[PDB]
């Protein structure tokens, strides 16, 4: 019915000790060194001198004070008002006569809080202040994580209070402020927080892995520059040939697959692991081997098991017993769908589109491969889907960048 | 003083059972499936129908009857006349009075045999019949292997006869015809042949790995087509910009590194292993982990340990005690040098050049990195060297293909 946190170490950290995968990692970072050397040489050729401009990151992270102010107000809101609302509701529930009306009132209050304060704020800051595209993504990912963990907090703390008031003890098991402040930075996503912990904080370890994140970000940056610039920077003498389109979906796979592997590694492994060992909770793995995945169910099961666990437990179970319809084969097909749309939302704000190639891509993916060789099929479909989504998104982004076309129903499909 | 053949299995065959490297292999073959699908789609777009032309292999393997006739005469020569010459020399040596003059006579006879019959034949077939470029490579690699194994045969069988005639026994330990015919197809390169053997012949195994070779060859083919065509097919509106050159040496690394990895795998692992288990001698590994290589000595030590063992034993030891000079630090720097030149020769015949970028590349490599982070330096230098050699060779090949310029001292360096 619940989840057990066991203190096993991260999978990739245990696996990276073997010398072969060690050499794969060294090959990756040698490729990065080659990238930076090629970039410095190209800059020294083009400008003659004065290397290391770093222009794309300056354009993508422009209004950074606005972003950090938005994050400050976001964090203080999601830290203060849900806790205070739950305190008031628990007191008014356990104190006096029939609180079912009061319970529905507080439930509406929390619903409007989450919806208003955590959609309107984060979404309308973007649509009002006209942020850079990458600076929208950080705050929208933050709002998604915050609403997920707030819903987790409430859904975990409701039934305990319910059963304790049914037992009718004045000692209401309300959570404290410090453990909530801890969970707000926890790498997990369920309010049953890191009661299993780590003994000490290896500061060399956290420094190494945080610098690893800081390096992987520049690896993403150099990948974007050296591959997404030559393939996409306004080669728009429109042939509309299927040859050019298939060559884009071919040539964008290497940047696509490198970005996917690298961002998996960076974000999950070292980002979370830095905020794990810095927070004394490195006591849970957050991804099994997603390459060892023949069927689709397993692939979703062990890619970013944080999101998978949150979605599975809360969405699957609660949203399932709420319906228990005659067609329960969609028990996953439903949640993935909204997952799709939330990813669509994640690509709706920062891209200023709604072009749902990820949505229909996921639908074709699932409805085609739900009905060892399966591992090869999974890898080839992953390459092709990654490549097509990357080429389509970059192509539409630069085609709308070509002409502003001043409701965005499928724009820039014609080369402007 | 000698070598011991132990029946340990191939390294990569034992390592490929682990599921992670298994997934790397499946990723590779899924990439190949994506390659062939992209090629069929591009052909169906360009021609409208009538897929699967296979033109480049028809041009590269044109005069195949001539190649197989050359190989037949090569094999029958190197199978008959060295054996007969050694028989006659051993008999005339152990039979009668002072054979030092006769021994020098037979030594000159074998020297002229190897030099004439195994340079002139194979090299002058090429320079007379004007073979396709890839069909030169098969016969020149065959002549190199044949001269190496013939020299091995003679250098192993001389001292045994010497010591046996010093002991003065009429039973001269001459080798038989069948074991020589076996060694001529043996995967090893030392005449101390596969006395350790395998019990049986797994025909499913040899069929699978031979089909694996046949697939890896097409993987090389599709790599060449989809990457070396767009980057190199006569984009010759000469800027002579350092930017275009560094972008070539950058963009040719992925085809370069894929070709190197794949050809290592294909040729060594499955080619040799098919001719190992089909010949009842899979009782020796022929490469350790060359990725786990920090220093240069180890890298050369365990890349294609067949050639390394032949060179090391015969060249190193014999050519070393023949000089034992005051500067013996070149004990490796010498042999590698001739190795370089033989590779240069391997790239002198089939490329119709002598452009020695591999030679000076190897020299800079060694003289710069002889004096974990070393693993990264090795990988980045390997990427850069592979890329520069591939771009230079393809560029010069296509630039000489542009205009024939009808002694080839550094041609096509100007864009024709
Ligand atoms: C059918 C054809 C395409 C198969 C091609 C197989 C090639 C791509 C694969 C199969 C097994 C692989 C090797 C297995 C493990 C390692 C250890 C790592 O530290 C470096 C890469 C290296 C050395 C791999 C390189 C590429 C490799 C040799
Ligand atoms: C400093 C930055 C560049 C490091 C980037 C590290 C990335 C490229 C590396 C480090 C460890 C690697 C993983 C280790 C082993 C495997 C198992 C194999 O079956 C699939 C690839 C996979 C999943 C690797 C993918 C790429 C990987 C995650
Ligand atoms: C830009 C080229 C494509 C790169 C792909 C990865 C980009 C960073 C994604 C980061 C994020 C959002 C956390 C994530 O992993 N996404 C994700 C997931 O977790 C919510 C679950 C999931 O189900 C199997 C599939 C998912 O992506 C398909
Ligand atoms: C075309 C792009 C570059 C691809 C590189 C591999 C091509 C096939 C080579 C096949 C062959 C000749 C057998 C070989 O492995 N060469 C080789 C070697 O053995 C003799 C020893 C050696 O010393 C460390 C270095 C060697 O190559 C640098």
Author numbering:
A (entry chain A), B (entry chain B): 118 to 488, 497 to 531, 539 to 548
Article, verbatim:
Subsequent 3D reconstruction generated a 3.5 Å cryo-EM map, which allowed the model to be built de novo. The binding position of CI-976, right in the catalytic center, suggests that it inhibits the enzyme by precluding the loading of substrate into the catalytic center.
SOAT catalyzes the reaction between long chain fatty acyl-CoA and intracellular cholesterol to form the more hydrophobic cholesteryl ester, which is then stored in lipid droplets within the cell or transported in secreted lipoprotein particles to other tissues that need cholesterol. Previous studies have shown that SOAT1 is an ER-localized multi-transmembrane protein that is evolutionary conserved from yeast to humans. SOAT1 is the founding member of the membrane-bound O-acyltransferase (MBOAT) enzyme family, which transfers the acyl chain onto various substrates, including lipids, peptides and small proteins.
